C-alpha cells in the first residue's frame with residue numbers, strides 16, 4: 001500500500017520530503033474531489049487530554065468528511081481519567097482495543113510516542129504533545145504556502161513574533177529547510193529570538209537567514225509573512241507593551257508588499273494582526289485554517305486506506 | 311520552673327500521669343480565678359494548615375483570655391501557601407523567629423513533631439495532626455470527666471460509635487488507662503470496633519473491658535457515655551443506615567441512667583445525639599466544649615509561664 | 621626452591637570485615653548504608669560459598685571499625701551476621717548484630733500521609749519483637765507496621 | 774576439577790572483568806546496571822592502588838560475558854576503563870568503551886514535563902559528542918541536554 005499506511009504520525013522530523021510531498025499531494029486531491037465514504041466503517045478516537053477546540057473541531061470534521069465514526073473526550077476535568085495513578089499506557093492499551101485510530105492531544109512532550117508503544121497495530125496521530133511536536137499544524141502550513149506560492153522551494157519567508165517558544169515556527173522552519181533555495185527573515189524581540197540550534201541547522205545546510213527588527217525592513221522581499229502569537233504570560237506586562245511595538249501587523253504596513261504574499265498566523269491572533277488587514281488580499285490565516293481539513297483528511301486517508309486517493 | 315515550662319505538647323502519650331494532673335489542676339485554678347494579663351506581652355501563632363473552626367476559635371479564645379496576641383492562618387486554601395514547594399520545615403524555621411509559641415493543625419501525621427525539630431526554643435502545641443494526635447482534645451475530655459465525676463479512677467466508661475477511626479477515643483482510652491480501676495464498655499458496629507491494639511493494652515494492664523451491641527445494655531452502670539461521630543462515608547449509605555440502630559442516642563434511652571452520668575461528644579453530633587437529649591441533666595457536650603478554653607488556657611500558661619498559677 | 625609461608629598479599633590490613641551475609645544483601649547494605657562512599661579501599665565478595673547448601677555475600681572495608689550500635693543495624697538484614705574488627709582479629713568476645721531498639725535513615729514509612737516523605741528529616745522507627753514479626757513504629761506519624769511491610773516498601 | 778585456589782581477595786576464571794574504574798564510579802555501575810542481580814559470583818575492589826599515583830575501583834564477575842553494545846555503555850561513566858574477557862584471555866580487539874549511539878534504562882530526563890517519568894517505559898537517549906560536551910536527546914520529549922545536566926538534575 002501507500003508509504004504511510006498503518007504508520008504512526010508523531011513527529012514532523014520523522015517525515016521525509018517524500019512523505020510531505022505525498023501528504024500534500026493527497027490533500028490537493030481530496031480538496032478537488034471529496035471522498036465522503038472513503039473511511040465509512042472506521043471508528044476514530046479523538047482523545048484531547050488537553051483541550052483545544054479549534055484543533056479538535058478541525059480534526060473531527062476531517063474524520064466526518066471521510067465518513068468515519070468518532071468517539072473521544074477532552075480530559076480538561078470533563079472525564080474520569082487517571083484519577084489517582086492510572087497511566088497513559090493503560091489508557092492507550094484500553095482504547096487501542098476499541099478503535100481503528102487514535103488522534104491524541106496531551107500536555108506532556110512525549111505522550112504520542114509513548115501511546116505508540118501500547119497501541120499494537122492501531123495508528124496514533126499526534127495532535128500536539130506539550131512543547132514538542134504538532135505534525136498536522138506544520139502540514140497545513142506547508143500546504144497553504146504551496147497552494148498560494150505554487151511551490152515550497154526558493155521562497156522568501158518571514159517569521160514574526162515569539163520565535164523562541166513558538167514551537168509552531170520551529171517545526172515549520174525545519175520543514176521548509178528540507179526544500180532548496182529558501183531565504184528566511186527572522187523578526188522578534190531579543191528576548192524571544194529564534195533559538196541558536198535552529199540557526200545552527202540552517203548554517204549546516206547552507207541556508208540563508210537574517211535577523212531584522214521590523215517587518216517593514218523586508219516587507220518588499222517576502223513571499224510569506226508568518227505571524228506568530230505572543231503570549232502575555234511570557235514577558236512582563238510593561239515588557240510586552242515596550243516590544244509589541246510593531247511585531248504587530250496593520251494594513252498600513254502592506255503598502256509595498258508583493259502581489260503574491262500571504263500573511264499566515266497559527267490563529268489566535270487577537271493581539272498581533274489588526275482587523276483592517278482581514279480585508280487585504282494578503283490575509284490568508286482563515287484560509288490557512290480552512291486548509292487544516294484537507295491536510296488532516298489526507299493524513300487519515302493515508303494511514304487508514306491502503307491505496308492512494310481517487 | 312514547672313515541669314511543662316517550654317516543653318512541646320505533641321502527643322498525649324508523652325504526658326506522664328503527673329503532667330495530666332498538673333494540666334488539669336491548672337485548668338481548674340484558671341477557671342476559678344482568671345488571669346487576663348498572664349501572657350500579656352506574648353505573641354502566639356495559630357497555624358491551621360487544615361481548617362478547624364471550632365478548635366481554632368477555642369484555641370484563640372484561650373490565648374486572648376490570658377492576654378496574649380495572635381497571628382496566624384487557616385490556610386485552608388486561602389494563603390500564599392507554599393505552592394506545594396516550600397517544606398513545612400522552612401515554614402516553621404521562619405515562623406519560629408516571629409512568635410513565642412506555635413499552635414498548629416495539619417493534615418499529615420507527624421507534622422507537629424517535625425515542627426519541633428525546626429522551631430527555636432519556641433514551643434509547639436499540636437492542635438491535631440492527621441489521624442495521629444489531638445492532645446488538648448483529650449485534656450478537655452479528661453478535665454470534663456474529672457469535674458463532673460470528681461475523679462478519673464474507678465469509673466464506668468462507655469464509648470459508642472466509630473471506635474475504629476475515632477482517634478479521639480483511642481487517645482481518651484489510653485489516657486484513662488493511666489488511672490486505676492476504670493471499667494470500659496465498647497459499643498460499636500462490628501465494622502468499626504475498637505482496634506485490637508487498644509484491647510491488647512488494656513489486657514496488659516488488667517483493665518476490665520467488654521463489647522456490647524446497644525447502649526441500653528449498659529446504661530445502668532455508666533458514669534460517662536462518650537458519643538462518637540460516625541461519618542457515613544466510612545461505610546456505604548445502605549450500610550450506615552442499617553447499623554444506625556440505637557448507636558444514636560435519644561432522651562427515652564436515659565430512663566435508667568445514673569444521676570451522675572454525663573453524655574459527652576467531640577461534636578459534629580448532628581447524626582448521633584437527638585436534640586431531645588439537650589434538655590436532660592445528662593447532656594454535657596456543650597459544657598465539655600466550653601472546658602476546652604480552660605484546658606488549653608492551662609497548657610499555654612504552663613509552657614509559657616515558669617511559675618504555677620494559684 | 622620452596623616458597624614457604626601461606627599468603628598472597630590479600631587479607632591484610634587493620635579494617636573491619638563483615639561476612640556470612642545472606643546472598644543478594646551485600647549490595648543492599650552497601651547502598652542502604654552508603655559504605656562505598658569512603659576514600660579508603662573495600663574488598664567485596666558476592667556469591668562466595670561457605671558450607672551447607674547455602675548462599676553467601678562478603679564485604680571488607682579498611683581503616684575503619686563499626687560502633688556497637690552500628691553493627692546492630694545489620695540485625696534486620698544480616699541476621700546473625702558475623703563481624704571482626706580486624707587490625708588482626710580485634711573482634712570483641714562474640715560480635716554478631718543484635719536487634720537495635722531504634723533504626724534510622726534507611727527505612728521508609730509505609731504510611732503515605734506521613735509528614736516524613738516530603739520533608740528534610742531522617743526517617744526513624746522504634747523496634748520491638750513479636751512472634752513471626754518485628755514491629756516498627758514511626759517516630760513521626762506514630763503508626764506501627766511489621767518489618768515485612770516496611771521492607772517491601 | 775581444575776580450578777585451583779581459595780581466594781576471597783583477588784582471583785580468576787571464566788568471567789568478565791572491568792579494569793581501571795575511577796573512584797566512586799565502581800559502585801555506581803553496580804547500581805545503574807544491577808550487576809549484582811547475578812547468581813554468579815562477583816568480586817569487587819574499591820579505592821585501591823592505581824597507575825602509581827591515584828585511586829580506582831575494580832569489578833570481577835565470574836561466569837558471565839559482556840558484549841559490544843554493553844561494554845560501550847560504560848563509556849559515559851568509565852571511559853578509560855578496560856574490559857578483559859577472562860575465560861582465559863579469549864579477548865580479541867582492544868576492548869575499550871566507545872560512545873554508544875543510544876543509552877537506555879539508566880539516564881533520567883531533566884525535563885520535568887517529560888511523559889517518561891510517571892510511566893512504565895524505559896528511558897532512552899540519543900548520543901552526540903560535542904566539543905567539551907556530550908548531547909543526549911530524549912526519545913520521548915525530544916529535548917536535548919548535556920550529560921552534565923542529565924547526571925546532576
Ligand SMILES: N[C@@H](CN(O)N=O)C(=O)O
Pocket residue numbers: 050051052053054055056268
Ligand atoms: N489549541 C489551542 C487552543 N485553540 O486555539 N484551539 O483552537 C491550545 O490548546 O492552546
Ligand SMILES: N[C@@H](CN(O)N=O)C(=O)O
Pocket residue numbers: 360361362363364365366577578
Ligand atoms: N472538626 C473540624 C474542625 N472544626 O471546626 N470543628 O468544629 C475538623 O476536624 O477539621
Ligand SMILES: [Zn+2]
Pocket residue numbers: 420729730731734735736758759760761762763
Ligand atoms: Zn510515618
Ligand SMILES: [Zn+2]
Pocket residue numbers: 110882883884887888889911912913914915916
Ligand atoms: Zn524527555
